[PDB]
């Protein structure tokens, strides 16, 4: 059978106090009856508000990024600071950070390793660009990104890792991957983990899909055997996130 699914909301750089209060109320009033881990990732400045208002017991709060250590890093937020305020999930290596903010495979792998050492659950993002897909490099790219992370982890650390496969061409564009496209990559990843890390790790690993997931396409993605849930951007700012959660039944 499949491991426990995850439905994760990446709000990105969005929100006002009023809109967040309304959306959290919607999430609180949605009764979830199956075993799923829901995750909401607000901007840093909204974490305290969401902590105060979110009561649905299926949810945890995640940060959208972090650095490993406190110190002289003006503008950044560290993992120890997040832990002290009660946040123990983080998204690392999102495409937007790899693209705009210079996060290379080695930077991502270092961050993931440090988060695991500090007791975080980590959603680590990987995925290929349109050019790489059309060059038939998808497998090489996603396995390179994954092996860079794996090189800095011990086997036990994998209990804290969730992989999110987000093809860059699907992020925010409306052009979701087909279920067959996503399943092909998820199966390739799970096999790599099984051979290189362990079959026990691979059977428990959650591999999420993201990139233009909405409430109408989520259930047909989740039907595939190696898809364990979703990392959702635009649709997670809307009430229809409730139906994305319920598509993981």
Q: How was this structure determined?
A: X-ray
5 phi-psi bin (left φ>0, alpha ψ -120 to 50, beta other):
beta
- Residue 71 has φ and ψ, to the nearest 5°, of 150, -150
Nearest to 248 by CA among 17, 68, 34: 34
Q: Which residues contact 207 (CB under 8 A, 6 or more apart)?
A: 162, 163, 164, 165, 186, 189, 190, 226, 227, 228
Domain, as residue range, for 11? 1-249
For 133-154, give the DSSP string.
Answer: HHTT-HHHHHHHHHHHHHTT--
Q: Tokens in use for 39?
A: 């995750």
CA–CA dist 145, 246 (Å, integer)? 30
CA–CA dist 219, 26 (Å, integer)? 21
Q: Is 12 annotated as a binding residue?
A: yes
Q: Is 10 annotated as a binding residue?
A: yes
CA distances 154 to 55, 151, 158, Å, are 34, 8, 7
CA–CA dist 222, 243 (Å, integer)? 12
For residues 93 and 111, the answer to whether their CB atoms sit within 8 Å is yes
Domain count, the chain: 1
Q: Which resolution, in Å, applies to this structure?
A: 1.1
Bridge partners, 161 (sequence order): 122
* Helices within 54-207 (DSSP H only): 79-84, 95-100, 105-117, 130-134, 138-150, 179-196, 199-204
Buried-exposed string 59-75: b where 16+ CB fall within 10 A, e elsewhere: bbbbbbbbbbeeeeeee
For residues 158 and 207, the answer to whether their CB atoms sit within 8 Å is no
Provide long-range contacts, Cβ within 8 A and 24+ apart, for 57-63. 58/32, 59/27, 60/88, 60/89, 60/121, 61/86, 61/87, 61/89, 62/8, 62/87, 62/89, 62/90, 62/91, 62/121, 62/123, 63/87, 63/89, 63/90, 63/91
Question: Within a 10 A sphere around the Cβ of 78, how many other Cβ atoms?
Answer: 17
For 171-187, give the DSSP string.
Answer: TTTS-PPPHHHHHHHHH
Residues annotated as part of the active site: 94, 166
């Amino acid at each position: 059978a499949k491991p426990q699914p995850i439905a994760a909301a990446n709000w990105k750089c969005n929100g006002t106090t009023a809109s967040i209060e309304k959306l959290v109320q919607v999430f609180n009033e949605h009764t979830i009856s199956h075993d799923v881990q829901c995750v909401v990732a607000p901007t840093f400045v909204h974490i305290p508000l969401v902590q105060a208002k979110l009561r649905n017991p299926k949810y945890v709060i995640s940060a959208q990024n972090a650095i490993a250590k406190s110190g002289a890093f003006t503008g950044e937020v560290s993992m120890p600071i997040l832990k002290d305020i009660g946040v123990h999930w983080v998204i690392l290596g999102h495409s937007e950070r790899r693209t705009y903010y210079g996060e290379t495979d080695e930077i991502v792998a270092q961050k993931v390793s440090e988060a695991c050492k500090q007791g975080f659950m980590v959603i680590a993002c990987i995925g290929e660009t349109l050019q790489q897909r059309e060059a038939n490099q998808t497998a090489k790219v996603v396995l390179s990104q994954t092996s860079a992370i794996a090189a800095k982890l011990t086997k036990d650390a994998w209990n804290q890792v969730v992989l999110a496969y987000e093809p860059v061409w699907a992020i925010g564009t409306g052009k979701v991957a087909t279920p067959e496209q996503a399943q092909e990559v998820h199966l390739l990843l799970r096999k790599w983990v099984s051979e290189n890390i362990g079959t026990d790790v691979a059977a428990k690993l959650r591999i999420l899909y993201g990139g233009s997931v909405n409430a109408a396409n989520a259930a047909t993605l989740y039907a595939k055997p190696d898809i364990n849930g979703f990392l959702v951007g635009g649709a997670s700012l809307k009430p229809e996130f409730r139906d994305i959660i319920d598509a993981t039944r």
